[PDB]
Amino acid sequence: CAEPEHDERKRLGLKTVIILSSLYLLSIWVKKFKWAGIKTRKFVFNPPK
Amino acid sequence: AEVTQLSNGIVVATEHNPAHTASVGVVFGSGAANENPYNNGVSNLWKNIFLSKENSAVAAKEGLALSSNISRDFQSYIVSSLPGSTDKSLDFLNQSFIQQKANLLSSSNFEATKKSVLKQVQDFEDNDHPNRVLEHLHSTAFQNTPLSLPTRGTLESLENLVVADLESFANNHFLNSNAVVVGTGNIKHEDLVNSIESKNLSLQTGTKPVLKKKAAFLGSEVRLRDDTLPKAWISLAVEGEPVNSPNYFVAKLAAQIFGSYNAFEPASRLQGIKLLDNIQEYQLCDNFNHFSLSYKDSGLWGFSTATRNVTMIDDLIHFTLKQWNRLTISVTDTEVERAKSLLKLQLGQLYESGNPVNDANLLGAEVLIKGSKLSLGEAFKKIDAITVKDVKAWAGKRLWDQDIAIAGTGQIEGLLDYMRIRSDMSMMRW
């Protein structure tokens, strides 16, 4: 009576949480790829005469 | 227009045309691409004693002129004569590369030459920013691989070089199977080949050089920021074509489409290049030039540029790379046709200058790699046969969504990160 949407709400949550989980894991991977040039960048200093 | 190459015990190549003077030289099939990180600069040092005041006076008495060139794939030592003295040039070649190749390396000569290539290579790094950048382009593009070594060598491998390093290199690369003797000028093939088969004596025949590991392009960058320089100088390239690639000429034509530019030359501002509409509005650069550099194992296709517009470098790079995108998708017939005509003109002006020392270097390098020289008229046949479809198929393989290599110096704070440049190697589509 208080929560008539209960069964349907949890079914939608299952889909929503699966999609968002995947999108989260995916974006981590895509971020690391897009940052790989910057993260492994190397500097050298040769003091000017 | 001739190409007569025949092998006795050595391999002799000539190309004669009644001009004025004659040039004779030996061209070895090993250059800076054959050195190490640690003896890097040995070839340049060899060149410099060959032209030392001692050896150069002995030639000037005889009325001979000396010339040498160190490249990546090869190496050349050249004497120019006055054309009846085509025999006295071969005397100076052998009196140097058999007799005096133990007398040129005298303690006082070597130390005064090493001191002069040190002031030489230092001056280069301090002041020649366009070639400095282009040399570092090869360095990063081909890192840890033979094509990465600079031709003049590095200051640190140079100052730690001794007479024995010259020796060890000369004993492994100045061999018979790694040599071609070249004659350009006006002298006949049978005029030279007989003066060569006159004297026998093979000298270290049967000895091969040392094998290695193949050259490879790695997408990368080296950024030599210097805010005290009044400009930014940048070079940017993809992996291009080796000599004896099917697309050797398609690549060279593609570079001619965008060509070269000089903002201060009125005529240059008027060329049939679409990129110029973009870059002239805010004057995005003082100059650029595209190139298709080809070597034995690989090559670089891209452009170099110089600019005082240091807050709009990103527009320079963006408009240039959007133009290159067009080669895969929308390059027009008349752009291709314009490039054909201008490629012929420039390839002509190269292969037939009025200077035989250039002819020797072009002949020498060619025959060392493919065992023959393609005639200028044969090239034009290949150039004229290129269609829009060819350029598109080439660009779609070499240019579109491909890694790049970048180098720069000067005020390059405005040259954006790698991934920004690299994303512009293509376009969004449905």
From Swiss-Prot, chain B:
Its membrane topology: Peripheral membrane protein
Domain of life: Eukaryota
Species annotation: Saccharomyces cerevisiae (strain ATCC 204508 / S288c)
Oxidoreductase among keywords: no
GO molecular-function term, one example from the UniProt record: metalloendopeptidase activity
Similarity annotation: Belongs to the peptidase M16 family. UQCRC1/QCR1 subfamily.
Self-association state and partner proteins as the record states: Component of the ubiquinol-cytochrome c oxidoreductase (cytochrome b-c1 complex, complex III, CIII), a multisubunit enzyme composed of 10 subunits. The complex is composed of 3 respiratory subunits cytochrome b (COB), cytochrome c1 (CYT1) and Rieske protein (RIP1), 2 core protein subunits COR1 and QCR2, and 5 low-molecular weight protein subunits QCR6, QCR7, QCR8, QCR9 and QCR10.
GO cellular component: mitochondrial inner membrane; mitochondrion; respiratory chain complex III
PANTHER family documented for this protein: CYTOCHROME B-C1 COMPLEX SUBUNIT 1, MITOCHONDRIAL (PTHR11851:SF126), METALLOPROTEASE (PTHR11851)
Assigned keywords, A-Z: Electron transport, Membrane, Mitochondrion, Mitochondrion inner membrane, Respiratory chain, Transit peptide, Transport
The protein, known as: Cytochrome b-c1 complex subunit 1, mitochondrial
